[PDB]
Design a protein around this ligand. Sequence first.
Ligand SMILES: Cc1cc2nc3c(=O)[nH]c(=O)nc-3n(C[C@H](O)[C@H](O)[C@H](O)COP(=O)(O)O)c2cc1C
Ligand SMILES: Cc1cc2nc3c(=O)[nH]c(=O)nc-3n(C[C@H](O)[C@H](O)[C@H](O)COP(=O)(O)O)c2cc1C
Lengths: 204, 204
Amino acid sequence: THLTSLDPVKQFAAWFEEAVQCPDIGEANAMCLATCTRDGKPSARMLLLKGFGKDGFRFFTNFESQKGKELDSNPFASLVFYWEPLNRQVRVEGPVKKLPEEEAECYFHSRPKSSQIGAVVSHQSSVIPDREYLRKKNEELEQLYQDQEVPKPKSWGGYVLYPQVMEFWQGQTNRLHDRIVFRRGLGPMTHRGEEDWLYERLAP
Amino acid sequence: THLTSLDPVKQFAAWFEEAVQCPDIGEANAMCLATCTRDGKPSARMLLLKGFGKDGFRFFTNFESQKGKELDSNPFASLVFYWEPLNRQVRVEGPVKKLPEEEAECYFHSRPKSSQIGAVVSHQSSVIPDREYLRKKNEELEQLYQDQEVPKPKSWGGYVLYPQVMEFWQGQTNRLHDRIVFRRGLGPMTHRGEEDWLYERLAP
Ligand SMILES: Cc1cc2nc3c(=O)[nH]c(=O)nc-3n(C[C@H](O)[C@H](O)[C@H](O)COP(=O)(O)O)c2cc1C
Ligand SMILES: Cc1cc2nc3c(=O)[nH]c(=O)nc-3n(C[C@H](O)[C@H](O)[C@H](O)COP(=O)(O)O)c2cc1C
């Protein structure tokens, strides 16, 4: 194996720490979120991990965006972390729950005022006429919210992905990449991890 | 807009060139491929772009892997290119066609012998007992194929994604990210690109 922990959330923590300390990785928490329609049309985009633990992986967005519409209709997702300078990939699959509105509100107000105003101004993924449109509306909302709290948009909040599958991939120069996959659940190549996790090695 | 071309495949080419010339990007052709089951369970993983043009985006894999099973069942995919040092993202969505077997064979034999043997040895995403298993089988196949052509596995080949949607995202320090989305297909904020493409600007 060559693992730090047989709890894959703690293995993730170990790798995440190493990615944060790597000077050649800009945002260690950048990840690709894949969603799809119930009818099976996939979509995917980058966003930032904003909290993780036993309960899973947290991220925030406008619920009226493509990703929010798909998660609300079809609450299953996949994440990919790719840390090229360390030749490492982490894949996560699992169901998603929307975060309580109180938790989203508290998180929203912990962010810089410019980010809060950014969320108000931008109906994420709606059509706009040009660049200047955005700059102008942002400055008008800056005026509106001088010395005042910015309210969280009704359409803004978070989700938590509860992991059911987690794969750790370490690339190798000889092409025989190390892949260790954890799944929640015995064959001779299948092994018991912590809690209800099982793990096995996969061919690259 | 701030674009090089209103054909989004040529816009992609322009950005791809800039990513290749960036010394802080290791593999400019690394991309995240999102697929899903017909029933709407998404999955996603990194792989390499291996050709692109008017017909679309080409990639190669074992058809018996998760991605191959999903594409064969449900031939729709999404790609994400993320070039952190340039603060750029490209998203592509479209249908997939499997490449002709003759084209796959010719491509397979153009690769280094070690890569060809790697494809034979590794039933991608099947379970294996340990690291040494892989090293040993690789060396045995090296013996078998000394001074001899390696046959392409029946289960190995490629796919081409024909783009229907392409988004170009340029991150900005002020958070008002530039997003220009091209779709194949008139509102006042929707514009004609080349061929059957339309484009518009989206809120970040
Ligand atoms: C590094 C990076 C991080 C991002 N983080 C987020 C985020 O944390 N939340 C978010 O809503 N969008 C984020 N985006 C923007 C998304 O790529 C996307 O433009 C947006 O969320 C709309 O996606 P959708 O239309 O597919 O739902 C990020 C983009 C980049 C490049
Ligand atoms: C940078 C990078 C490039 C990769 N390129 C490929 C590839 O080109 N073809 C491929 O089959 N797997 C590639 N992989 C491995 C995939 O991440 C994955 O392990 C494998 O294809 C099996 O995926 P699946 O089980 O989801 O189908 C790559 C991994 C990394 C980190």
